[PDB]
Amino acid sequence: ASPFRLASAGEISEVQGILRTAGLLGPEKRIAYLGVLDPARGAGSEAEDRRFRVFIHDVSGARPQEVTVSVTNGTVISAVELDTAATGELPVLEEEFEVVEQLLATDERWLKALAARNLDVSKVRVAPLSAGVFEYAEERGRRILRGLAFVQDFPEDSAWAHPVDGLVAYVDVVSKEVTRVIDTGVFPVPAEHGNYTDPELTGPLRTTQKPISITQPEGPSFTVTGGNHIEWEKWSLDVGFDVREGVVLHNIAFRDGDRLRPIINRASIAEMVVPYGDPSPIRSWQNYFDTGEYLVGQYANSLELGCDCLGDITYLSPVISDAFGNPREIRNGICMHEEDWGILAKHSDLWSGINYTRRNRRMVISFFTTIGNYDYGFYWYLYLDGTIEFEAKATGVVFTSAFPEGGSDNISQLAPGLGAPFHQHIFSARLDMAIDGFTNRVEEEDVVRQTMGPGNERGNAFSRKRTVLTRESEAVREADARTGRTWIISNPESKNRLNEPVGYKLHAHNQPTLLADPGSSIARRAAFATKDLWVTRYADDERYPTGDFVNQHSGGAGLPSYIAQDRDIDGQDIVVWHTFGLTHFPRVEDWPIMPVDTVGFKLRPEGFFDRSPVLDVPAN
Amino acid sequence: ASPFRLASAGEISEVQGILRTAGLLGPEKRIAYLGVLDPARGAGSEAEDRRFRVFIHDVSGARPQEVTVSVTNGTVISAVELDTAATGELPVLEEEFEVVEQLLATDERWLKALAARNLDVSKVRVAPLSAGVFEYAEERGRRILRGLAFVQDFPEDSAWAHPVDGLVAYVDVVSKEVTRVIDTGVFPVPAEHGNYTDPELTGPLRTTQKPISITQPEGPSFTVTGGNHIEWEKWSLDVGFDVREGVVLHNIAFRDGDRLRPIINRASIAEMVVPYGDPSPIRSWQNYFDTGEYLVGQYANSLELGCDCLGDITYLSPVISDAFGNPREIRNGICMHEEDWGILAKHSDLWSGINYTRRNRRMVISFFTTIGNYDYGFYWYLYLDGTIEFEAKATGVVFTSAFPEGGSDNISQLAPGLGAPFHQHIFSARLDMAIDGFTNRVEEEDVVRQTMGPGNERGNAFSRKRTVLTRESEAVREADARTGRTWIISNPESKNRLNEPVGYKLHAHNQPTLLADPGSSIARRAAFATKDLWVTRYADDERYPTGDFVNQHSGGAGLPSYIAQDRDIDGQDIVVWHTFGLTHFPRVEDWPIMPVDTVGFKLRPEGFFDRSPVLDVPAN
């Protein structure tokens, strides 16, 4: 009965019926996005109204639509025809993944390019690549995908091992026209295979790994109620799933004594982009909003027990829409489990003779997704001591190219003739904060060094300073690792026993942000990425730092536009947008399949509690 | 038979005999440090010569001694009388921990101070605190400890809850004179207790934690041979233990195909200091070299199975000397085990239809120690993919003071009237590098942003640059998080299959370094701490970045002095000294006992291997 429950197959079918009956779902229509809408604010006393938000595509060439419907009242709440040159194109469809290769398969330019390289068209894979926005005037208002080719030698060959450099094509997937084919010249196609399951490459597999058994004889310490509501070691939350963002956390709160204390209203990865830094015209247009353009949630994997999730695992199976509004289940797409996490607290005292040791543990909510060559794990952790943490795990196969004779300042060689262009993976965590409720503010905290002198005669003193961010036009902050810069979210109206506003402190990894020249297309389209921290005033229609329609959108949209409203953020319903990412110069070790690398952030309680919240934890 | 084996009780007793027979170990003598010496370089074909290094104290007031002996040949190799005003005083003795409180127990100044506060002397604990070097001219050449007082209400009371502010005393532990007693005035002594085992404070303990069982039915995947030699998943190392540094790693190498490939010759935490930033005269002299002054290894705890080390655990029990050269065993002072570490690599390919997932794991070598209020865990991790990682875990009880009426810019309030002065914990990792052997160099690598223009028309290109550090006078580097700064250790004479020097890349957390004013005493005594990275030329007598005798030493010694030699580090036997630490502004959550916080660093292979070194890992 919780408004925050996961979408049911039944609900998805109702949406399809509603649209179909309203005439909005003819045979040429396609569902590119379907997601349930969160309950609105001002409903501290309201009745069930489940609404869903739909983006509908037309394959015949008609204008696409944005539509909101109520699945409790079977009504179209809103239906609007979009102008895509203006507000952007709809997310890429999985059904379009095969299209580029097929269109080029009958184009003479393409075939001429393939023949010159002596490549059999039936062996040539073409990645379905988001096109972004550059100089091609005929592209405005058209649904374009760009194509880069990789030879697959046999049905189970890793095509990534065999990039075709010096060649790219653009295609209009609607009109089914190949608009441009560009051959800058021939590069040898790297020859080695990258088949990480070939005994010829793996070699004799190891027999040295003895098993590690992790079990819970009394079951797990967390309970799940009403499908997705979690209670665990004082924590309370709802686990959501959206096809764009993937796993989303709702109503994170902590049970302190006899109060249920809210901390974060909604946590999600609201965007993730992969900009490439290779100035070759074959790739310099590459920037993949894996979240905004492709929708990470639709491609979450079914996690295999013992393989993908070890221990006592509890699965949720989130239901999504297909392109035709049928409900599809992602069997075991979400793992939920608790794991030991080493020592929590420990002291042996030289005076009391007391020896004290307590173990830590964390609740994990995770899922893993695939977007082309990439595979990402998205993990949320709740710790006994009140800490909240996110962690992304980056693996899969590196996006490949030729390695240029003479080397490169922008590409790494992984194997003979084989290159990997430099890129970043930059995430945006959207945190709808609710520290003891919605009245929150953000302060930027820096370490303050003090000069030796009067009142600091020995020159040992150091301090800190906090700066309240009061309006959106001054809540665009950058990192400063050198001065230990963090950001504190507090409630100015809720004090702890020492009469201090309760707060939580954000600790960022301080990784480099978007490296692109500010004048670049990507800088404008991914402006969120150019700064570590943004704070906005909450609003119903400000969901992604890149706006609702990322694909082939002009730029400026999203965060840069919202903060133009310059709204009061000093003791209000606010949202923190945290930029964090990996700058990836590929190594030989990354090839032929890459070991997990990680990035993330965490928040620790800062005067939230009146003392350590883990004194009541028993001693094993 | 390995030269790198742990010291045996038998060996310790021989050292004592040798010294005793040589006349160096009379009843007034004390052993303040005892440690075995590593085999020297140039012994690619030498015979067993076990030597030990001793620091001997005299309680009658005679000059202390440094002595080196051979336990295989029962000879004094060297014995030297130290001038402590010049080269520093010997490490604090555990037997001196009780001394300050006792000396003050009969001093009229002290008693007057206690009586004014109405504190029963028999309830007044006095921390035995390292004194450092300030303005007190009569202190040069004397063995001084400073005292700060904490009331213990009953045998099992946490005295930390009850600091006596506005009062400090200095004592000469040798002459047993109280040199100065300083009362800046009375502060109320905070009243609440901090007894984290009192049901009155803990409240009803939790019953919600279900058990988590971690077992290995076929035993562990690592073997231990000759006491301390570890082989695990291609890795080879020797696990050492020194009473100063604690757990030390020797001969880290990786078995690649049919070669044993060295990576690091010796890894240790060579120093750790805790500077306080409270300008009160009562504490402004506080800087505790937990490693250099107190010796962390002597206070390692015996780790309790199921409590301190979970899973299939293999213990080493390192033997140390007591103050009288008797061998004492630290039962189970070192845990060695392997743990699961989530996903190692994963890809589901849209073209081959292959789905691939492999699990990760790490070998842990750890120990946990107590120094007064502090308790630290020191963890070394070796990962399947070649990654080497260190992690310090900081817990225990915060060092306390009064909280000043009117607040403080340098102290946090944890409870009514109770303060916690701001401080840092700053570590120095000494890494005697051996990348494919001893011919190594270090490059500093930064991200390079490129300006939009000719040859970068779209403004998407970004690159990097590496700068070889050639001489010691230019190998003192600072962090630059903003430009993703890392440091690469490579062997210029050993290339990978792509003809690139094999390397390992150091990734630092980029935490703030020493915040003290450069003109401070601590800045000079802890100069290593003022910069993130130092590279030196290897030498036999350059062990600690702070020199051999930290206690009451003048300053300048250690790293700043070694790099003055300005030696060739470009393709030579080199050592990286990495500074890393926590800047700790204590929170309410830290009280009455603090949850673990962490800091560390890691190194990842960078073109070391010709491809991913984990293709041969089997698929669960």
Ligand SMILES: [Cl-]
């Ligand atoms: Cl998981």
Ligand SMILES: [Cl-]
């Ligand atoms: Cl990648």
Ligand SMILES: [Cl-]
């Ligand atoms: Cl451990």
Ligand SMILES: [Cl-]
């Ligand atoms: Cl502390």
Ligand SMILES: [Cu+2]
């Ligand atoms: Cu990458």
Ligand SMILES: [Cu+2]
């Ligand atoms: Cu601390």
Ligand code: NA
């Ligand atoms: Na536009």
Ligand code: NA
């Ligand atoms: Na909010």
Ligand code: NA
């Ligand atoms: Na001196």
Ligand code: NA
């Ligand atoms: Na070396």
